[PDB]
Amino acid sequence: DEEAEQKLFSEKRVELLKELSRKPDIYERLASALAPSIYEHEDIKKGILLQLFGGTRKDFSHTGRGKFRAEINILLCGDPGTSKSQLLQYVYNLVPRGQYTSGKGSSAVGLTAYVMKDPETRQLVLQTGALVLSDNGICCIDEFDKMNESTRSVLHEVMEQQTLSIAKAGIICQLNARTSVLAAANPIESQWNPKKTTIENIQLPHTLLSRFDLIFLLLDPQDEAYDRRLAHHLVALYYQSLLDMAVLKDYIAYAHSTIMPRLSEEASQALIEAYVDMRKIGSSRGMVSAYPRQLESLIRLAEAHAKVRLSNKVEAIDVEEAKRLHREALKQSATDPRTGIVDI
DNA sequence: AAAAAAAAAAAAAAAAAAAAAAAAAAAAAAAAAAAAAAAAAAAAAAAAA
Numbered sequence: 079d080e081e082a083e084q085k086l087f088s089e090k091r092v093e094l095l096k097e098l099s100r101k102p103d104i105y106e107r108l109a110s111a112l113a114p115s116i117y118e119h120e121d122i123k124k125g126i127l128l129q130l131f132g133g134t135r136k137d138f139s140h141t142g143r144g145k146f147r148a149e150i151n152i153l154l155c156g157d158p159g160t161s162k163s164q165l166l167q168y169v170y171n172l173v174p175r176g177q178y179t180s181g182k183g184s185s186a187v188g189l190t191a192y193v194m195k196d197p198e199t200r201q202l203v204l205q206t207g208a209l210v211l212s213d214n215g216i217c218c219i220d221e222f223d224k225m226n227e228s229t230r231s232v233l234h235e236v237m238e239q240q241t242l243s244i245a246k247a248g249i250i251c252q253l254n255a256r257t258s259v260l261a262a263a264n265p266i267e268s269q270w271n272p273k274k275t276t277i278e279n280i281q282l283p284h285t286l287l288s289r290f291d292l293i294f295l296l297l298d299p300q301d302e303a304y305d306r307r308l309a310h311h312l313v314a315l316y317y318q319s320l321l322d323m324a325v326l327k328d329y330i331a332y333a334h335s336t337i338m339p340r341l342s343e344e345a346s347q348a349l350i351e352a353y354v355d356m357r358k359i360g361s362s363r364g365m366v367s368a369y370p371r372q373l374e375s376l377i378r379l380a381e382a383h384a385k386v387r388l389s390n391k392v393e394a395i396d397v398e399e400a401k402r403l404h405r406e407a408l409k410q411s412a413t414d415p416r417t418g419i420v421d422i
Numbered sequence: 423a424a425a426a427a428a429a430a431a432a433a434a435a436a437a438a439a440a441a442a443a444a445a446a447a448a449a450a451a452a453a454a455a456a457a458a459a460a461a462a463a464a465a466a467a468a469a470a471a
């Protein structure tokens with residue numbers, strides 16, 4: 079509602095935002111402002127920032143095609159203790175219109191809608207669930223793997239059609255659910271074992287995986303130096319004693335209100351080439367396969383990156399960053415045709 | 423060993439008839455009393471050497 083109303087920013091504030099947009103490291107600087115007390119998950123924070131900006135909302139009514147999913151979906155899969163839940167909790171406590179779910183505490187009707195009695199008018203009233211409450215926001219699903227398949231089947235329609243067609247006795251209707259999904263899962267056997275492929279080790283249906291347009295593998299490199307650095311960060315966090323949030327908030331609201339990035343010609347060609355190369359790279363045995371849904375993924379991420387720069391026009395740097403982020407998540411460089419992830 | 427199933431199986435809510443319970447509820451007629459008035463019998467005081 080605030081982004082809707084036109085006098086949210088003074089002119090000098092708009093100039094301040096625009097001057098911020100012109101810095102070379104605005105993407106880095108905005109991503110780093112997220113979760114300031116989480117130590118160097120820079121790419122994850124970039125992806126979450128892109129989720130906050132979102133892709134471009136397009137009207138596909140005349141194409142007779144069905145609504146396009148402009149929201150960005152992220153899976154954080156990694157071995158335990160790697161700060162996934164802290165990121166989901168940070169996002170949950172940051173956005174308006176969010177919901178947080180963990181494990182088996184949610185049922186399918188509890189995620190979509192059900193009928194209760196109004197204990198003040200004794201009328202049966204339909205009441206929404208967690209995925210409709212976070213309609214124009216973000217749903218953070220924690221312990222995504224530890225979630226029974228009856229209630230994850232619900233996520234297919236939400237994550238593709240952005241709608242939720244309940245066909246029950248009382249009323250049948252399509253509830254709109256334009257939520258962005260931020261999920262955290264453990265691998266099969268709740269620890270990456272490096273003798274299994276990515277697919278064998280994530281253990282999620284290829285359809286469900288294709289619905290996520292970033293999969294960050296939060297693997298733990300058995301690394302002395304990184305352990306030392308994170309140890310110092312965590313201990314310093316016990317004796318504690320940037321980019322302001324009041325400008326990050328305004329920057330994001332401005333980007334939502336004014337910027338609607340459109341694909342340019344070089345972006346279009348780069349997207350085509352990126353999709354073809356992505357299919358060749360992921361067509362291997364145990365790697366995460368690419369589908370046309372991943373080309374739509376790339377379009378979304380590129381539009382989000384162009385929204386970060388207040389670009390209002392997607393060109394080749396945005397597509398390059400989308401492809402780079404899609405590679406870095408999933409550790410495409412550290413896999414191989416004999417699928418399996420190396421220690422860097 | 424876990425992963426879908428595929429039932430119990432419990433609750434809340436609904437119905438859904440029963441079968442019991444609960445809630446509404448002045449005016450019309452009569453009689454008796456106490457008072458009158460009236461026909462009859464009865465009991466008074468004026469008449470006279």
Ligand SMILES: Nc1ncnc2c1ncn2[C@@H]1O[C@H](COP(=O)(O)OP(=O)(O)OP(=O)(O)O)[C@@H](O)[C@H]1O
Nearest residue numbers: 115116117118156157158159160161162163164264
């Ligand atoms: N950059 C970091 N990497 C790993 N751990 C961190 C980092 N920063 C902080 N931590 C600490 O590590 C702990 C990780 O707990 P958290 O619940 O986030 O783990 P998780 O990966 O989300 O859960 P799971 O064990 O189910 O995968 C947190 O308490 C946090 O304080």
Ligand SMILES: [Mg+2]
Nearest residue numbers: 162163164220
């Ligand atoms: Mg956790």
